[PDB]
């Protein structure tokens, strides 16, 4: 899932089984593996 912000798209943060959160990560404009 990619959530577009006002500055581009990014990988949204996700919750780990232990309750902590993995940080969100910006993705280069126009990039897709």
């Amino acid at each position: 899932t990619y959530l577009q912000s006002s500055e581009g798209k990014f990988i949204p943060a996700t919750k780990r089984p232990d309750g902590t959160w993995r940080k969100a990560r910006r993705v280069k404009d126009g990039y897709v593996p």
Binding site: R16, R22, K23, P33
Partner: protein, 127 residues
Amino acid sequence: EDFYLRYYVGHEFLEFEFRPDGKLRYANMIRKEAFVHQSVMEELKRIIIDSEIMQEDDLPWPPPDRVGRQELEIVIGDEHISFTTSKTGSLVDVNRSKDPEGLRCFYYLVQDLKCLVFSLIGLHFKI
């Protein structure tokens, strides 16, 4: 601040290890050894910390399979991890686990580590 990293995947296998003094051991037969500059060690640590892999748990991830297994041991200061899983050749395999998001962080960190090691060993030994 202590440091250690070892990655294993596989008797066919690929294995590499970074000791605290910068000694890089590679094995895939092909066994190479070389000492990397402190800047390389600094960059390795940065990549590891940025991946947040030290905050993950491999409990929900697939155990060593028949097709193979993976081992990731990392020590940074007082923090450390020791993960053991089955092979993860692609994202489609990652997205098929109980904790796909966690396993993808593992998948990408491993990918980043291999890219760095392959560049170091490949260019240094013209492999």
